[PDB]
């Protein structure tokens, strides 16, 4: 059971270039490569990657090629230049995963047993998702379902490292916004923080429309049982939470009589100091 993966920011980048290498002839719309990583704890780390010649045909949709021979020797070279690094899994792109991914994963679990795949989105780069990591489990299946492979979820993030954030800050130099700017910046944090509140809402909007309609089979295990836990706790009971709002008056009180008065009086000093310096330099000009 893997806790989470850590995206070193060289690997994604090194997927973008190889999608751009074949992209002059790119019509396969998918690039499989090998995900190198550093196994630390239950938490996982990723440091490097490389590619592999890959083909696939939708006709009979099981005809494909990793190259074991290319995977042995080139990883052997990265082992020689760096003994710290080993394989932890693989990756592909083209955000809709395809039916073959059971076959690639169950093949190369004989290189690392708890292997893990990461889907990146090279063309989608817009709203809320950097990557995603999948994992395989095989229990009986459930209380009452037929057995299968069933790609499961591992939560993901983007990590960093000292002496690579230097390459982050120096290569961008574009907008260079700090979190400070507490009037302008924090309000916009509340703005687009709420623009994802309806974005996750419109996603949970669309899911129960197409399962109440009844197209896809209802996941009786987690897909609403975790929502059954969810839908009881926006507590808004009034007549004691109404009495939260003299603390609102208390938070107001420091703003009103302290910050409006002193800011006005200090700028009033700048009037008399200027009106003296105006005319006493005017009467001494002649």
């Amino acid at each position: 059971a893997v806790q989470k993966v850590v995206v070193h920011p060289l690997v994604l980048l090194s997927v973008v270039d190889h999608f751009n290498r074949i992209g002059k002839v790119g019509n396969q719309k998918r690039v499989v490569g090998v995900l190198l990583g550093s196994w630390q704890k239950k938490v996982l780390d990723v440091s490097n990657s490389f590619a592999v010649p890959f083909d696939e045909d939708d006709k009979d949709d099981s005809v494909w090629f990793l190259d074991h021979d290319y995977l042995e020797n080139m990883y052997g070279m990265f082992k020689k230049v760096n003994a710290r690094e080993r394989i932890v899994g693989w990756y592909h792109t083209g955000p809709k995963l395809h039916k073959n991914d059971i076959a690639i994963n169950e093949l190369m679990k004989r290189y690392c047993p708890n292997s893990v795949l990461v889907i990146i989105d090279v063309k989608p780069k817009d709203l809320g998702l950097p990557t995603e990591a999948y994992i395989s489990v095989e229990e009986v299946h459930d209380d009452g379902t037929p057995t299968s492979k069933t790609f499961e979820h591992v939560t993901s993030e983007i990590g960093a490292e000292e002496a690579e954030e230097v390459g982050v800050e120096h290569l961008l130099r574009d907008i260079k916004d700090t979190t400070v700017g507490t009037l302008s910046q924090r309000i916009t944090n509340q703005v687009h923080g709420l623009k994802g509140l309806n974005s996750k809402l419109l996603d949970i909007r669309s899911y129960l429309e197409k399962v109440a309609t009844g197209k896809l089979p209802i996941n009786h295990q987690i897909i609403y049982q975790l929502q059954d836990v969810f839908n009881l706790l926006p507590d808004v009971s009034l007549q004691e939470f109404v009495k939260a709002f003299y603390l609102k008056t208390n938070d107001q009180m420091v703003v009103v009589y302290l910050a409006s008065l002193i800011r006005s009086v200090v700028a009033l000093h700048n009037l008399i100091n200027n009106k003296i310096a105006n005319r006493d330099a005017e009467k001494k000009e002649g």
Partner: protein
């Protein structure tokens, strides 16, 4: 980072780096003295380096490395926050008392020279409203997050 490139011995009594009609040579570095004490400039030459900055990489590195979704409307709520509002006002009271002291002083001891002989990294306007701005921004972001959360959720 800097990139260099060796010169020959054919122009050794002549001016090396045979550069010509351009004006982008004076930038990107002057020859530094920790570098020109060695083989610069009669052994190689220095060259100019810029970056091939591209789109389809720049924003996906920016937005994906520094990002937090639900952080923008958290609270850090009140027991850590009313204590901070408690603290800052107390020395600001004495800062106001020190602000009174210079204003009621107001002597013609050549007051631009009286201010330079009374330098203390202190009151007049520097140790002023700087705190008041922090008291303003902290309570506004605290109360705007408080009012929006009552609005949205039920």
């Amino acid at each position: 980072i800097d990139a260099f490139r060796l010169i020959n011995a054919n122009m050794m009594v002549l001016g090396h780096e045979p550069r010509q009609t351009t004006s982008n040579l004076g930038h990107l570095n002057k020859p530094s003295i920790q570098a020109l004490i060695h083989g610069l400039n009669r052994h190689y030459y220095s060259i100019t380096i810029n970056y091939r900055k591209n789109e389809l990489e720049q924003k996906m590195l920016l937005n994906l490395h520094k990002k937090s979704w639900m952080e923008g409307l958290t609270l850090q709520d009140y027991s850590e926050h009313c204590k901070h509002n408690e603290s800052v006002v107390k020395e600001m009271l004495e800062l106001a008392k020190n602000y009174n002291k210079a204003v009621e002083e107001e002597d013609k001891m050549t007051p631009e020279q009286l201010a330079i002989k009374n330098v203390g990294k202190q009151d007049p306007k520097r140790h002023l409203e700087e705190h008041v701005d922090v008291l303003m921004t902290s309570n506004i972001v605290q109360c705007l997050a408080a009012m929006l959360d009552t609005v949205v959720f039920k």
